[PDB]
């Protein structure tokens, strides 16, 4: 219902969206464009990394999980710098920067 109506943005529907990708997909189907019970890409993209930074998404020591969160929200610079710090994934982060360049 609230995937069709883009409502109840605060309720993460955790009963059915238990994975991270299920959350991203749940919200990107809820973002809106031009006051209550409404979320926009700017709020969502900022809300995610500002409040729930790397710390929240890298506790499982899985780096790509956070990268996908930033890249699939149009925050390409964040995801590039972030992934560029993983000494094992420097190569990959430089190139995804070149492509964007």
């Amino acid at each position: 219902y609230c995937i069709i109506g883009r409502c109840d943005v605060t309720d993460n529907q955790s009963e059915v969206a238990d994975k991270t990708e299920d959350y991203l997909w749940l919200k990107l189907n809820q973002v809106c464009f031009d006051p209550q019970d409404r979320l926009t890409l700017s709020q969502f993209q900022k809300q995610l990394l500002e409040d729930y930074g790397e710390s929240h998404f890298t506790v499982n020591q899985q780096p790509f999980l956070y990268f996908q969160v930033l890249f699939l929200t149009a925050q390409f610079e964040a995801a590039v710098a972030f992934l560029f710090r993983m000494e094992r994934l420097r190569c990959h982060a430089v190139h995804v920067a070149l492509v964007l360049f």
Binding site: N12, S14, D18, K19, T20, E21, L48, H56, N60, F64
Partner: peptide
């Protein structure tokens, strides 16, 4: 309260 469990 988003989960941190990656789709595996």
């Amino acid at each position: 309260a988003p989960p941190v469990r990656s789709i595996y």
